[PDB]
Amino acid sequence: ARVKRGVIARARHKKILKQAKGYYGARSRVYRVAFQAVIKAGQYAYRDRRQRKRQFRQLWIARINAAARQNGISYSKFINGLKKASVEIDRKILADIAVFDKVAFTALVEKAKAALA
């Protein structure tokens, strides 16, 4: 029972070659390097899925410090006063109301400064 294997190998090659569209030159035309390109892209995605949570937290911390420095109080003392005042607001939406609001951030800074002093 001889079986020809023309359809299966062509479908397997076309499945991989469809995942490598938009690559420079011979990395998007031949199979022997598109396989390695797909593997390396998957590994880089798997690492950057962890790196994204560090990058966005660093951006939020920089924005929080830049917004809090205008009212005459550093980032560390502001966070320590907020923790001593028992406020459970996280770094993302606090930076969001720091960007998109000014009176509420001023009231929050005054509350933290009153709680620390």
């Binding site: 966005f56 951006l59 920089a62 720091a98």
Partner: protein
């Protein structure tokens, strides 16, 4: 929902005037590089600059603490060859403002965005500036 980002065609930047008579070199250059990057604004984003234009005058009166006026040495290579070596005193006596610029070039990031940020700084060696039409503001540092 996504966090806010700063569009480059809608942000606002102002003008400031910084005096440099008797101020320390590094302790002024650090503040200038921090203000040029846009790190003092709530809309700070790393991939697009948001800094303000800064005019520095009286740049030949900058003082350095210690004995660095005779032993601080600047080297420069032509890219071939021979090297050009100078000290502080003949460099301020020849071209003063370059020294301040060199300090800013030591502190800003590298790449196209670094020189794009460095373009915003204008340093004058005298006391008169011709940018009075832009209506600058006096900043104390």
């Amino acid at each position: 929902m996504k966090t806010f980002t700063a569009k480059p065609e809608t942000v606002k930047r102002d003008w400031y005037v910084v005096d440099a008579t008797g101020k320390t070199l590094g302790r002024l250059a650090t503040e200038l590089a921090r203000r040029l990057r846009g790190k003092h604004k709530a809309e700070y984003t790393p991939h697009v600059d948001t800094g303000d234009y800064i005019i520095v005058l009286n740049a030949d009166k900058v003082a350095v603490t210690g004995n660095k006026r005779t032993d601080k040495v600047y080297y420069h290579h032509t890219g071939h060859g021979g090297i050009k070596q100078a000290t502080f005193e003949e460099m301020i006596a020849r071209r003063p403002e370059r020294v301040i610029e060199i300090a800013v070039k030591g502190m800003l990031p590298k790449g196209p965005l670094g020189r794009a940020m460095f373009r915003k700084l204008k340093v004058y060696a005298g006391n008169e500036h011709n940018h009075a039409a832009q209506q600058p503001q006096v900043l104390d540092i």
